[PDB]
Amino acid sequence: NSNSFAGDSSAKQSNSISGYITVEVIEVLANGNLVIRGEKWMTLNTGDEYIR
């Protein structure tokens, strides 16, 4: 006789962003925390990119 089994699984995920974005305060909370929001648009040659 000869019986054999092998089973595996895998997964992987990563991301990164680098840059700057300047936003503004849109709301002040009860404890003093600041809700922020803003967008930034750049048209370099052709096509518009945005950061939000």
Binding site: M42, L44, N45, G47, E49
Partner: protein, 52 residues
């Protein structure tokens, strides 16, 4: 009034973006043999498959 301007301009802008998607499947099974004979389901179907 006369004012002298030194022309010294240098602008440079680059942008890039790319995306990838890939998926593959490969499932294969030889016809099952039990008791020295090839098992049959229904009347003409084996225990085998092939996906790619």
């Amino acid at each position: 009034d006369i004012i002298t301007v030194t022309l010294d301009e240098t602008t440079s802008a680059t942008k890039s973006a790319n995306a990838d998607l890939s998926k593959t499947n490969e499932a294969q099974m030889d016809p099952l043999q039990v008791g020295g004979e090839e098992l049959q389901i229904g009347g003409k179907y084996n225990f085998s498959y092939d996906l790619n």
